[PDB]
Amino acid sequence: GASGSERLLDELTLEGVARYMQSERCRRVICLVGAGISTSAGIPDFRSPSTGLYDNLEPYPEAIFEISYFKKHPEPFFALAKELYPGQFKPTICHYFMRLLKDKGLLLRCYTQNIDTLERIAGLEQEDLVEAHGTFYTSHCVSASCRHEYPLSWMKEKIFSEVTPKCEDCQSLVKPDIVFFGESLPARFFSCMQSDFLKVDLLLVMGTSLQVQPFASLISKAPLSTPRLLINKEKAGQSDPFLGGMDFDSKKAYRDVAWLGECDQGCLALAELLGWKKELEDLVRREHASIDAQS
Template sequence: MIHQLKEKGMSWWIKEYVLKRAIPIPKLLYAFDIVLCRELRDKRPKTLLFFLKVALSRQLSRRDKLPAYNTVDDAVNLLRNSKRIIILTGAGISVSCGIPDFRSENGLYAMLKQRGEYDLDDPQQIQIYPSNFTPSPCHHFIKFIEDRGQLLRNYTQNIDTLETLAGVKNVLQCHGSFASASCIECRTRVPGKDIEDDILRQRIPLCKVCQANAAQARAAVAAAKKQEQSKKKRRKSGNPWDGDHSEDEDEKGIPKVGVMKPDITFFGEKLDDRFDRCLEMDREKVDLLIVIGTSLKVAPVADMILHIPHSVPQILINKTPVKHINPDIVLLGNADDVVVHLCERLGWELPRAKTRPEATREGLRKRPSVETGKPPPQPPRRVGNSHVWLFEGAEGGNWLETLEIDSREPSVFGDSPLSQADEDEEQVDSHNDRGAKRARVI
């Protein structure tokens, strides 16, 4: 039952065991070591189904790592041979474009927290408006995979539309984008460029259709009022207007002028139904999941990884560890550096991308496209005998140090012999300064 749940998903499982086989929910819960007291067993089916979904979600969150995949070589082979790849992306793939991420050590939240300019409890309380940015190597990497016919779909949490600018066709912008905006009153939709000037000048963008309708209604009211007044005798005071008339009456029947809201999903709002439909279709086809540049903290997109069949290999490419998931290969570092390394190993040549400003604690500084005197990038380094590899820019602190120590124990990851390339890399590392090596890990 647990195997079927992890492979076929919660919806299939509930249909099979609750509807088709008609097994009582308390009995199903008992199979997951959950015993309901008599009072709860007598609850309505809707309440019992909620308890069951909680239990199933807990099981889905316990993914077992696939022991066959551990190394960068394994990641390269998966990229070369997979036919239907889902790529889930977040803010980390746009950092090099000049758009800071939220939660990393140098992310936007850390920058604002240090400055003390805003009283923020959570990075979700700020929005970024995309300006004149160009796609990063990560965006071109996704496009390259699509051009090779290997991309099943790119699910992006970003609203900057850089995937589209890079030419990616099969992309689902889970949280919407600034590509368009809609009136909250009449639902008129316009291109995002139509409201850009108002937003950048910190003006509230108002719906032009609503404004025209309101102006037309006011003109009609004024004409009717004038016609009515012309039929009345002027008062002795010479005032042509009725004394009991108020400005509130003028607004009766006048439609409200709506605000143009960018077509993005704000925090607390429900995602478009297309997200659920696409995930339901794609989970039956996917043969590789790659997560790039996201800490997977914002539901429901963060939860989609739980609903992919657990037998599908997973690769995480991120600056920091994501500790609540269990991917098969973890490549920590600057996302651009990681994908460029993988492409070099695969013999893939990405389009040249212009380097844009990069976020720092001091603000946004321009980084030259060619940095003279910069040493060539160091090869990735394996953390102990684990499935975690470190590239330039990797963060992880004590978690990495603990993992390196623990992964040296054979019982933790089982027998995972090193490939020839790994053995050569280990020999090279043995000649390096051990103290400097540990300092980099910490």
């Protein structure tokens, strides 16, 4: 139930969440993540004004996002892809915390808004993942009668060689599997959401301001009793008083917890409460060393 009934969290704090997680009542965790979990990996949020995307872009700046424009004028997109292509893909502490959840048998699903493929590199598998905004990991020929699939290694070569990618079978445009403005979200998002939120014991919301729909409205799909922990630089998910959502601070707040700071630091703090800190340290250091050593 709502604030009217006996709550699952013994107190609304990171400490309360940790005790809940290690009790028998918490089995399945859904993560909802956004650009805020990749910034410490050296990938800025291209939606944040501070990142300065539109300065790099100089008809209108938004055309870069539109599927209609892309299809008749693909060259800008692929030039930008080369410019913004990460120099390294090295997932963050936050990403590997989710790998730990998987290892500990607690991870039901990770829903991500990010296109950077860092969840995959960190060891989440396809079954574990719903890429709500799509991804660069795979690309497809845009011809409905072909739809030939291409791996990132193929797309990357085309991107860096500055050759507009064309399908080897039919010579139609090949488009990364990211959702362009004008495209619907993947069917997978909807079918998975319908099943997963019947099963969820805890919602871990990290590095997202929950301003972009439908992804944002996911938090309202949780059962009334399900605790929701936000790890983010600023509070988010509260109902717009002008236009329910998160209630962290009111006299009725029973399930929602905000931990404010960098996602890496919040995940580190939670891992330490859980007795996972050495495990996380060991995992991150190993995987980071491996990635740094790529030859």
